[PDB]
Coordinates of N, CA and C and ligand atoms in Angstrom, one line a residue:
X687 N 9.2 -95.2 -82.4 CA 8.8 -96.5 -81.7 C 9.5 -97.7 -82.3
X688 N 10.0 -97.9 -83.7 CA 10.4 -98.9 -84.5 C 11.9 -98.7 -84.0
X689 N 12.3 -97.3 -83.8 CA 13.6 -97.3 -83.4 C 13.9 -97.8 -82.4
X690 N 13.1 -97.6 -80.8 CA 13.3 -97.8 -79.8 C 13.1 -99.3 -79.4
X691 N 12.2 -100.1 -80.3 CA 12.1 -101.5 -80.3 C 13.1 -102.6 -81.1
X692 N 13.5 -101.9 -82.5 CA 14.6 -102.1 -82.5 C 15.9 -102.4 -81.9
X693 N 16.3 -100.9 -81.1 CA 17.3 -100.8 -80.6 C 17.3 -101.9 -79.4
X694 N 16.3 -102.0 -78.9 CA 16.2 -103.0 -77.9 C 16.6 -104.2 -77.7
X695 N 15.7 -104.6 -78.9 CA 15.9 -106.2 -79.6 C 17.3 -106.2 -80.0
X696 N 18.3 -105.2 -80.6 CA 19.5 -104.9 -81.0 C 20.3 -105.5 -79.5
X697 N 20.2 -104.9 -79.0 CA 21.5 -104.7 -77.9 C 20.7 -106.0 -76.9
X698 N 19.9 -106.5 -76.7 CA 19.5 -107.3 -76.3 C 20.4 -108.6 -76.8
X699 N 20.5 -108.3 -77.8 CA 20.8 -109.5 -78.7 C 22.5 -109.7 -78.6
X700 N 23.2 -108.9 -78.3 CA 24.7 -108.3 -78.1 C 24.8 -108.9 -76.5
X701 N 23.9 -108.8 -75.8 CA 24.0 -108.9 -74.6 C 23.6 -110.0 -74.1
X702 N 22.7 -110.9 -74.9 CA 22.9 -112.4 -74.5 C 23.6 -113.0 -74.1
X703 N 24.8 -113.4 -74.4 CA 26.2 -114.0 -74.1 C 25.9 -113.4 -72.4
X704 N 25.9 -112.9 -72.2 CA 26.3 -112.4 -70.7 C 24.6 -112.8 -69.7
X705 N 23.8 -112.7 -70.3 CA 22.5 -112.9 -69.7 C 22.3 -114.4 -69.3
X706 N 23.0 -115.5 -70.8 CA 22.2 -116.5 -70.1 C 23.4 -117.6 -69.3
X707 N 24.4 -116.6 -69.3 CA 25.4 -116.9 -67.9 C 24.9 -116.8 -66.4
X708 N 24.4 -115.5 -66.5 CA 24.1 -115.0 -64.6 C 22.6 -115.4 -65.1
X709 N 21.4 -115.6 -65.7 CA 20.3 -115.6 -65.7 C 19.3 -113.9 -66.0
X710 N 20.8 -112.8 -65.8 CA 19.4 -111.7 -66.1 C 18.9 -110.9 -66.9
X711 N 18.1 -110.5 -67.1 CA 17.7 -109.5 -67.9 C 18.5 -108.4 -67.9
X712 N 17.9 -107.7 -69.2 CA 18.2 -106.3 -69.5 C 18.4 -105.1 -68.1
X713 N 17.3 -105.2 -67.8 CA 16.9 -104.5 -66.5 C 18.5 -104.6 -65.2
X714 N 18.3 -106.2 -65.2 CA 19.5 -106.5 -63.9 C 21.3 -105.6 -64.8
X715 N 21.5 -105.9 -65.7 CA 22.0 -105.0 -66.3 C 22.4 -103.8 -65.9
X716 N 21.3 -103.2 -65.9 CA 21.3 -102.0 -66.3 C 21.6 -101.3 -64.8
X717 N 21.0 -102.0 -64.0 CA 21.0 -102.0 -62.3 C 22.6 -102.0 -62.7
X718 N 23.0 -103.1 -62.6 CA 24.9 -103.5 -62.5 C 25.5 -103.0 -62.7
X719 N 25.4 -102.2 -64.0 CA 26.7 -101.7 -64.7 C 25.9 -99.9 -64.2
X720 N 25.0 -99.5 -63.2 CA 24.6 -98.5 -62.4 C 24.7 -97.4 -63.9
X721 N 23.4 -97.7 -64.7 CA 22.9 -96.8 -65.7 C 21.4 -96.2 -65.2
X722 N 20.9 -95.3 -64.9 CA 20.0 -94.7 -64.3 C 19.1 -94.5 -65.7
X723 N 20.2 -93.9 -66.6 CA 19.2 -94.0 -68.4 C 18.3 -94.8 -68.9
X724 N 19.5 -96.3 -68.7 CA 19.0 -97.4 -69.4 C 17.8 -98.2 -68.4
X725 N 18.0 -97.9 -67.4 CA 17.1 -98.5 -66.4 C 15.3 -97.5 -67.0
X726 N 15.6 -96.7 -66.7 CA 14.3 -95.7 -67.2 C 13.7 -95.9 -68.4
X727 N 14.5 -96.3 -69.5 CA 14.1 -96.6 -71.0 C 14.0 -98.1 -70.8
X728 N 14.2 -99.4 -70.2 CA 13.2 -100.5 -69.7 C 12.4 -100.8 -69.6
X729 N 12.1 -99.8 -68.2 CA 11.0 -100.2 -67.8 C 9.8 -99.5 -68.2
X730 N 10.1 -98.4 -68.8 CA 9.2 -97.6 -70.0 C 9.0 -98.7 -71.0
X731 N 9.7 -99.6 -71.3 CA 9.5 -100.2 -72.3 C 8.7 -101.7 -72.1
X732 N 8.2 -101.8 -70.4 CA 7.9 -102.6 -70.2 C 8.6 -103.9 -69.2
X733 N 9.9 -103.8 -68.8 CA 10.5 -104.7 -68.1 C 10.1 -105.3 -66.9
X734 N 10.0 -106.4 -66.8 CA 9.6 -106.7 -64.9 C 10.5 -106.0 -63.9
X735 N 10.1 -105.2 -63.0 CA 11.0 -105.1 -62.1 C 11.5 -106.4 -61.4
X736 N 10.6 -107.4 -61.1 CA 10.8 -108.4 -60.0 C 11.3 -109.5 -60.9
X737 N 12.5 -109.9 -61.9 CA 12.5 -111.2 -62.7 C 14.2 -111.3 -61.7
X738 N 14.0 -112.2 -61.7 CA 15.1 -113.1 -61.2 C 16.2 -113.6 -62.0
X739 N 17.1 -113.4 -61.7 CA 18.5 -114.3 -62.5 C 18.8 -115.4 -61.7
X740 N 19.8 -116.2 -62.2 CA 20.2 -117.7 -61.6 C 19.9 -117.6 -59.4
X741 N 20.7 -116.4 -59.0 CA 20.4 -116.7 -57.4 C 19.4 -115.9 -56.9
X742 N 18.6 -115.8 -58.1 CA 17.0 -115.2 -57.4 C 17.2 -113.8 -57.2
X743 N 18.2 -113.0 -57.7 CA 18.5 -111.3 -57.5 C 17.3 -111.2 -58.6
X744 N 16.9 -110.0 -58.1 CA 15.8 -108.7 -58.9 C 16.5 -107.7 -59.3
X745 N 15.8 -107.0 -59.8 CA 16.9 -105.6 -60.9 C 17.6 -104.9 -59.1
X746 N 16.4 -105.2 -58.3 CA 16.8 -104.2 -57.1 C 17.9 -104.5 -56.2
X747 N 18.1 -106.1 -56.0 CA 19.0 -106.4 -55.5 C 20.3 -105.8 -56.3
X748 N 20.5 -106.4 -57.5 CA 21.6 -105.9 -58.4 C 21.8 -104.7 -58.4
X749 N 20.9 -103.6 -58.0 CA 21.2 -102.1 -58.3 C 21.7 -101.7 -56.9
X750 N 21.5 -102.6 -55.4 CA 22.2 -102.2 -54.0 C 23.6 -102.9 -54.3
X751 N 23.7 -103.9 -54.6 CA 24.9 -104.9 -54.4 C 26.0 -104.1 -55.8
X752 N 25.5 -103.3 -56.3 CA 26.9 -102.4 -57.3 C 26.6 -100.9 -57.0
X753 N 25.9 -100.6 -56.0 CA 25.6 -99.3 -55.2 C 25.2 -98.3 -56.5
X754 N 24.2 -98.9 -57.1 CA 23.7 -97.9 -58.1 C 22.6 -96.8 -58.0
X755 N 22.8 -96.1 -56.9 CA 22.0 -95.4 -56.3 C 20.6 -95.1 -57.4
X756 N 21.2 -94.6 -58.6 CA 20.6 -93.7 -59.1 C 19.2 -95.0 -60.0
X757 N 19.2 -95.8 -60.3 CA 18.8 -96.9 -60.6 C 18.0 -97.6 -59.4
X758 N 18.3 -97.4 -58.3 CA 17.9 -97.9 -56.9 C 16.7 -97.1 -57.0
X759 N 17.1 -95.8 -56.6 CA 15.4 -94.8 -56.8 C 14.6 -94.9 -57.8
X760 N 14.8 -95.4 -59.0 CA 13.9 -95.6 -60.4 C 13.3 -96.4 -60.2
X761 N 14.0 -97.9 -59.3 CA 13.1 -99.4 -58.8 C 11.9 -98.9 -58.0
X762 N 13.0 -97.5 -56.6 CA 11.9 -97.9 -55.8 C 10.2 -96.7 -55.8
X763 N 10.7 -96.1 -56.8 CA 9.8 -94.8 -56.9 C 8.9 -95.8 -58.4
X764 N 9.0 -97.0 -58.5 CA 8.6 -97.8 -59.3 C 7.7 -98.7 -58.4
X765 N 5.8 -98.2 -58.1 CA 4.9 -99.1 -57.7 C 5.3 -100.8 -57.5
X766 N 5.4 -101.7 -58.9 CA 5.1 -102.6 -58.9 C 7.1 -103.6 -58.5
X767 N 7.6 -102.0 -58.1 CA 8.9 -103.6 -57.5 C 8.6 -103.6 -55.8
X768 N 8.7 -105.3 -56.1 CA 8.5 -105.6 -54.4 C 10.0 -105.4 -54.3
X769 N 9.8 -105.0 -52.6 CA 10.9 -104.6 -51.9 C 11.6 -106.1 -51.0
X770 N 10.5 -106.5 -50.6 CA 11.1 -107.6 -49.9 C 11.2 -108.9 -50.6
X771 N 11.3 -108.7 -52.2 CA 11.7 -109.4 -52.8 C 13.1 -110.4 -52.2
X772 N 12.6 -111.8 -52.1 CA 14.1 -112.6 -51.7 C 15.1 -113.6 -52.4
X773 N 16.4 -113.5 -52.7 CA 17.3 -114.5 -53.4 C 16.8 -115.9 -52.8
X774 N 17.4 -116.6 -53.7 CA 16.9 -117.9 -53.2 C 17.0 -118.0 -51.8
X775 N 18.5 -117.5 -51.6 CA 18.7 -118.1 -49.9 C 18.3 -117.0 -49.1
X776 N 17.1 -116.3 -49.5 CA 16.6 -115.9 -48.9 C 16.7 -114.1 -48.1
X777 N 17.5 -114.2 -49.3 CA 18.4 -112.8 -48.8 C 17.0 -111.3 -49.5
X778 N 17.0 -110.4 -48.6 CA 16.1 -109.3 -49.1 C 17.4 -108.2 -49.4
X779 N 16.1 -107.2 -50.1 CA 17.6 -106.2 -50.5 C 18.2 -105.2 -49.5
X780 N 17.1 -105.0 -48.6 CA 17.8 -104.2 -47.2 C 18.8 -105.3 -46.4
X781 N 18.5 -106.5 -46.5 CA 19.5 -107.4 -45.9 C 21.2 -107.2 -46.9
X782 N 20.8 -107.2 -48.1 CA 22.2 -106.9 -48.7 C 22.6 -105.5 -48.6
X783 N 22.1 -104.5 -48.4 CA 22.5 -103.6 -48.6 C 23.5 -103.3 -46.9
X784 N 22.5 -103.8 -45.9 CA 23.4 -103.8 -44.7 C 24.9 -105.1 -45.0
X785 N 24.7 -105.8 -45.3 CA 25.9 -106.8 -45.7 C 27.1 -106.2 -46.2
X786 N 26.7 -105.6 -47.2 CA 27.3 -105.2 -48.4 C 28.3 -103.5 -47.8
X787 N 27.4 -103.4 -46.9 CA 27.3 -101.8 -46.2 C 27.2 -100.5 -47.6
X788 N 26.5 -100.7 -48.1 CA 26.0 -99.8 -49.1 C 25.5 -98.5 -48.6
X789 N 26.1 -97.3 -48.7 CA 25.4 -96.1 -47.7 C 24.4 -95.7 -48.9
X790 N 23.3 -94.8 -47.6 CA 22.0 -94.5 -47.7 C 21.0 -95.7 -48.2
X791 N 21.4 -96.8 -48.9 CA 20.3 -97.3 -49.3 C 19.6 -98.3 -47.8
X792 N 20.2 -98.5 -46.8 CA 19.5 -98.9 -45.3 C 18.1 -98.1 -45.2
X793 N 18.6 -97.0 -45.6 CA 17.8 -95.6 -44.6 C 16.8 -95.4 -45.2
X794 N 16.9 -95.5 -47.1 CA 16.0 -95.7 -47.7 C 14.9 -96.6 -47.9
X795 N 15.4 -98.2 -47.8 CA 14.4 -99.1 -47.9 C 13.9 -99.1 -46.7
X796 N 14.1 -98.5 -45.6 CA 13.7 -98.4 -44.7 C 12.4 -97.7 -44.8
X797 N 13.1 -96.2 -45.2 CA 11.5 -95.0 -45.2 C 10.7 -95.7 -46.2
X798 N 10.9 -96.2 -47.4 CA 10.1 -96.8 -48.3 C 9.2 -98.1 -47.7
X799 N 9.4 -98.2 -46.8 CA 8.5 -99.4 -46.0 C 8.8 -101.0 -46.0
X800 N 10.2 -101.6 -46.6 CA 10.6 -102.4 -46.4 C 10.5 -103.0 -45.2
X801 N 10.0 -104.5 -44.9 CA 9.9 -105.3 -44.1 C 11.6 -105.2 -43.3
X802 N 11.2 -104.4 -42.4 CA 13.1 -104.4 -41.6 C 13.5 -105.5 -41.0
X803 N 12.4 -106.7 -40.5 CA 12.4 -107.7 -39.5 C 13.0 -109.1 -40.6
X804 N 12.7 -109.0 -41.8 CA 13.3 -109.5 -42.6 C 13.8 -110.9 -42.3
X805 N 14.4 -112.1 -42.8 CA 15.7 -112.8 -42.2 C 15.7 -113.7 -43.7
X806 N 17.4 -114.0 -43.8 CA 17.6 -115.0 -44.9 C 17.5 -116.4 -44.2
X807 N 17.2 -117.5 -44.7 CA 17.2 -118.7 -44.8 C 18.0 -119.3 -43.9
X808 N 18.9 -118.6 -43.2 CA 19.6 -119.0 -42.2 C 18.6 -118.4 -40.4
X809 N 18.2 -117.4 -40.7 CA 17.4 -117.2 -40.0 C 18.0 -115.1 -39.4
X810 N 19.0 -114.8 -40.3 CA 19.8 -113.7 -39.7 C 18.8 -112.1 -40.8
X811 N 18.7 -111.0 -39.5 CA 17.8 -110.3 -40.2 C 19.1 -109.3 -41.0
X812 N 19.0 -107.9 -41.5 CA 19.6 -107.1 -41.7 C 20.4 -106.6 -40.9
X813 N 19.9 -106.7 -39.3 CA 20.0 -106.2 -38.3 C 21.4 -107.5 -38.1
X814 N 21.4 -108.6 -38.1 CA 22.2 -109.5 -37.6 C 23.5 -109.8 -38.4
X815 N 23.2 -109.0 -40.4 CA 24.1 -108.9 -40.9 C 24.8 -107.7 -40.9
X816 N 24.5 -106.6 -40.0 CA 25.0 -105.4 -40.2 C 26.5 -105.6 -39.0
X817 N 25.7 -106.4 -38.1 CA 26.3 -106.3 -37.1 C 27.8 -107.7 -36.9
X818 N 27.5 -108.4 -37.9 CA 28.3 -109.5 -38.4 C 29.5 -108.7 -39.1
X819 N 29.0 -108.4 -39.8 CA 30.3 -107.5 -40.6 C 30.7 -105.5 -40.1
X820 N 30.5 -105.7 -38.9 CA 30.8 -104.3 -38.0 C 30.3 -103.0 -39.1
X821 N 29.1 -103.2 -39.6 CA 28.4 -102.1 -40.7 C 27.6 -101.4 -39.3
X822 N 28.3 -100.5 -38.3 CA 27.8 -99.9 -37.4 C 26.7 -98.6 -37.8
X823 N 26.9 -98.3 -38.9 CA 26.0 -97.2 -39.5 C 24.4 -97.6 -39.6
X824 N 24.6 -98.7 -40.1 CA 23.4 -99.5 -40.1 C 23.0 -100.1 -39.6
X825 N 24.0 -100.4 -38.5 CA 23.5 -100.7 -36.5 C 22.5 -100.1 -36.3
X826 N 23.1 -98.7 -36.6 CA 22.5 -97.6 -35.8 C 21.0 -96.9 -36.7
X827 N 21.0 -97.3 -37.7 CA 19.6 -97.0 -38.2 C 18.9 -97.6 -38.3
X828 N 19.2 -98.9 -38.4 CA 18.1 -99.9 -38.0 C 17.7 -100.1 -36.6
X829 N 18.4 -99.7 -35.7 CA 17.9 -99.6 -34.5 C 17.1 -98.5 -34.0
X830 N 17.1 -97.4 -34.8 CA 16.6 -95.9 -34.7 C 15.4 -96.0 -35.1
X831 N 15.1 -97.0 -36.2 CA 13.8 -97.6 -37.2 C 13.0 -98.6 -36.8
X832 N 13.4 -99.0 -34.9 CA 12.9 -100.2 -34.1 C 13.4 -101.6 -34.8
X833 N 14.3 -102.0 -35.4 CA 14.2 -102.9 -36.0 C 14.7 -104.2 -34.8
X834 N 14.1 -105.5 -34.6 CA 13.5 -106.4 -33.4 C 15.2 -106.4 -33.0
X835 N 16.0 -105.8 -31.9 CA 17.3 -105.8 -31.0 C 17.7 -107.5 -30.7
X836 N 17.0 -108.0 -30.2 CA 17.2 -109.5 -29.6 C 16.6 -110.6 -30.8
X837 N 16.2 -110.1 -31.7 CA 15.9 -111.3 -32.9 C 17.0 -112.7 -33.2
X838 N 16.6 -113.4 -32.8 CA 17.5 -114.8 -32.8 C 17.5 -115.6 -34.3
X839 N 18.5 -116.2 -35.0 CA 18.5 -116.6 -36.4 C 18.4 -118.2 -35.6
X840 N 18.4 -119.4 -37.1 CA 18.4 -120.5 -36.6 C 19.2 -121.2 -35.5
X841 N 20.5 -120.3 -35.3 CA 21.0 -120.9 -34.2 C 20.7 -120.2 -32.9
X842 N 19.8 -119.7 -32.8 CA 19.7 -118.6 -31.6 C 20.3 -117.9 -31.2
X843 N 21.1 -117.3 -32.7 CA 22.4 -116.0 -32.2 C 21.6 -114.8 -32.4
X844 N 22.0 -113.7 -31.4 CA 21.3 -112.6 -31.6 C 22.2 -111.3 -32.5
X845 N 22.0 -110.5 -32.4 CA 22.8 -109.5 -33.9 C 23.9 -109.2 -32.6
X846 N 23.8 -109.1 -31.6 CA 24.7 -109.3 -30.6 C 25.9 -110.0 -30.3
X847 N 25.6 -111.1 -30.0 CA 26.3 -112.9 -30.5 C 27.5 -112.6 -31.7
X848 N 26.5 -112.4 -33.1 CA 27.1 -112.3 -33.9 C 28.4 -111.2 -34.3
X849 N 28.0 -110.0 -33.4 CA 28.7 -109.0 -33.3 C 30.4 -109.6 -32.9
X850 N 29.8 -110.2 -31.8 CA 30.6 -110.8 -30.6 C 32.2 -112.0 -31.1
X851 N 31.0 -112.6 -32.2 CA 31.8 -113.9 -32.7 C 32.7 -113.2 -34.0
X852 N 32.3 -112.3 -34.8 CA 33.4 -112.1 -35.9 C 33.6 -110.5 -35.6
X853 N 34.1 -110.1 -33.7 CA 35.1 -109.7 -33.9 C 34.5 -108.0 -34.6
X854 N 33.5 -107.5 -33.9 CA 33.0 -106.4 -34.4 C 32.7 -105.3 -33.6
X855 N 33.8 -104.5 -33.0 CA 33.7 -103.6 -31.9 C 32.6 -102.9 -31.3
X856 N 33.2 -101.9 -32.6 CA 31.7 -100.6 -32.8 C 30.5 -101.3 -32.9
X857 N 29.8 -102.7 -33.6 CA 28.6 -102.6 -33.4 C 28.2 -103.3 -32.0
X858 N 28.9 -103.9 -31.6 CA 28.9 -104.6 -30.2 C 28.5 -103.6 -29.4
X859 N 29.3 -102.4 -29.4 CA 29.4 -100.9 -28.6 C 27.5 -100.5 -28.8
X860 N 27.4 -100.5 -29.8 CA 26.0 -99.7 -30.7 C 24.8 -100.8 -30.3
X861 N 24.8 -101.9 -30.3 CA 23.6 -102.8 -29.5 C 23.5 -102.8 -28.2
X862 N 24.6 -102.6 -27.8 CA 24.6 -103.0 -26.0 C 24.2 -101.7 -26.0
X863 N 24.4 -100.0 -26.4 CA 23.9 -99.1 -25.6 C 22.7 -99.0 -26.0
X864 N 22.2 -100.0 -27.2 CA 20.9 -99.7 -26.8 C 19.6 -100.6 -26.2
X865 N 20.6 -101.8 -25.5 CA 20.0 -102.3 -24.4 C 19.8 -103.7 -24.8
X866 N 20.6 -104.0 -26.2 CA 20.3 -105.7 -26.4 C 20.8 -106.2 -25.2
X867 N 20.5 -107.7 -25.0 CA 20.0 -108.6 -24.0 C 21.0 -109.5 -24.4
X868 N 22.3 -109.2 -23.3 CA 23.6 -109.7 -23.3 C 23.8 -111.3 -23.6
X869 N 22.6 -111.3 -22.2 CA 21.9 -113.3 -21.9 C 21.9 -113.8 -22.3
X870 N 21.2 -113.2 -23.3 CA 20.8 -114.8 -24.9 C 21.7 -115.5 -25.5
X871 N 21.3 -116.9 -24.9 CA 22.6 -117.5 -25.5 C 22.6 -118.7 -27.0
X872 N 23.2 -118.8 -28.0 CA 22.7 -119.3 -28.6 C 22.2 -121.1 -28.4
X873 N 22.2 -121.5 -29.4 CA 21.8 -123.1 -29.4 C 22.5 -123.9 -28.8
X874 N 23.6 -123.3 -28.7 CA 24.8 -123.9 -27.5 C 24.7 -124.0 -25.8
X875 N 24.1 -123.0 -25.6 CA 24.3 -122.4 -24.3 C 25.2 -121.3 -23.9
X876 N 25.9 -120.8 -25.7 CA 26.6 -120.4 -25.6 C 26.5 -118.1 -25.2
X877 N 27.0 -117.5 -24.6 CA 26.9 -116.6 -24.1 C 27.5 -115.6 -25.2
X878 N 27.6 -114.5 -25.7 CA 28.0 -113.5 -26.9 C 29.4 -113.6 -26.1
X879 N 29.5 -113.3 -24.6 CA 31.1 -113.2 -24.1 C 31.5 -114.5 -24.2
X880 N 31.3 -115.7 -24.0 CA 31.2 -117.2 -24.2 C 32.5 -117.2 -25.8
X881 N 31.3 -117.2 -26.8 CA 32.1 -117.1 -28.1 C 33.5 -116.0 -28.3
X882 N 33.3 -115.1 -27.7 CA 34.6 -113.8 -27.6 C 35.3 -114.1 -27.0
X883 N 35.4 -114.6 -25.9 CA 36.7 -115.4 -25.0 C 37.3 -116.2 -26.3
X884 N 36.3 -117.0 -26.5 CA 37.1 -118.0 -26.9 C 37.8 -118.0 -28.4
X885 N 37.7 -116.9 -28.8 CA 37.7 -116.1 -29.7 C 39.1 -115.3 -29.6
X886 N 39.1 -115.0 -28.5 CA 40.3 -114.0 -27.8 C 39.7 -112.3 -28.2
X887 N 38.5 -112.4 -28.5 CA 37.9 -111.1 -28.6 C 37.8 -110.3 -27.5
X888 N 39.3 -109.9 -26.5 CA 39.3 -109.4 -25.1 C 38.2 -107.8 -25.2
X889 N 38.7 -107.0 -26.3 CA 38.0 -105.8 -26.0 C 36.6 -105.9 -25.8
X890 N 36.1 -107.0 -26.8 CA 34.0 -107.0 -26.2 C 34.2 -107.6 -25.7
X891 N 34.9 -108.8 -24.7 CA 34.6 -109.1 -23.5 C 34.7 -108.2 -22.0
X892 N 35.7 -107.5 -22.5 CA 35.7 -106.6 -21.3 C 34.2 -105.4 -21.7
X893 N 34.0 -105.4 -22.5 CA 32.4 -104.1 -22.9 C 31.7 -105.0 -22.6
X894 N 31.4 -106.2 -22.6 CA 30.8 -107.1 -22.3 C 30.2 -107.1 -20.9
X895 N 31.2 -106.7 -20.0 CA 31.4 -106.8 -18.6 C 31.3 -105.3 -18.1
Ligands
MG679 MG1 18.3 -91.3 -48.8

């Protein structure tokens, strides 16, 4: 016990310089640099799952956004970490992990009961970043998991729109077949084919059509 509190306080102490740069703890650490060991001897030791560094990341964000799988299941088979824990701007960690396109962890915070409907601060769900950055995999699981098809962010873009505007084939392909609502246009008036024209995004305008 003297050893293991020791050693703590030890390497804690080695590792300040780096903590009270980004804001985090031992824990976010341990997530980052994807140690499944040191994560386990933490929070045995008492760590918060849910402390925040400078942009509001949790150990769990940190452990999708460096795809530390094995550290991810220690958080989430861990009761007391919230899942829909959010970065300041609002970001959850199934929203980064579709961003980021991190495989399996979608599918997981998913079965684990993560809020899918989700949205960051801008108003864009998981669903709206997957399809922003053509992460078609996670198109398609989030949509297999009901997650809301026509959900509009603050500008009334739909994951559709968004697909549409940066130029994202396959997910454009993967909402329309499953019946998103071409129509919705955002704040503009503007139409998903609307922004692609003008875009010169010919291929989803012609799928479009
Ligand atoms: Mg899995």
């Amino acid at each position: 016990t003297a050893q293991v509190i020791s050693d703590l306080l030890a390497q804690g102490a080695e590792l300040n310089a780096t903590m009270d740069k980004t804001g985090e703890t031992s824990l976010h650490l341990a997530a980052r640099f994807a140690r499944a060991d040191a994560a386990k001897r933490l929070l045995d030791a008492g760590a918060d799952a849910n402390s925040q560094d400078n942009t509001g990341r949790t150990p769990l964000h940190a452990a999708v956004a460096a795809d530390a799988m094995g550290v991810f299941q220690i958080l989430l088979r861990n009761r007391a970490t919230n899942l829909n824990a959010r970065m300041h701007d609002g970001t959850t960690p199934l929203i980064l992990a579709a961003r980021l396109a991190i495989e399996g962890m979608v599918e997981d915070l998913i079965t684990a009961d993560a809020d899918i409907n989700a949205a960051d601060n801008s108003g864009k769900t998981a669903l709206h970043w997957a399809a922003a950055v053509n992460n078609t995999e996670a198109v398609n699981i989030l949509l297999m998991h009901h997650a809301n098809r026509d959900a509009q962010d603050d500008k009334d873009e739909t994951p559709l729109f968004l697909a549409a505007r940066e130029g994202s084939y396959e997910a454009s392909k993967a909402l329309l077949d499953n019946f998103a609502n071409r129509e919705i246009t955002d704040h503009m008036d503007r139409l998903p084919r609307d922004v692609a024209s003008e875009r010169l995004h010919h291929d989803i305008v012609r799928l479009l059509d």
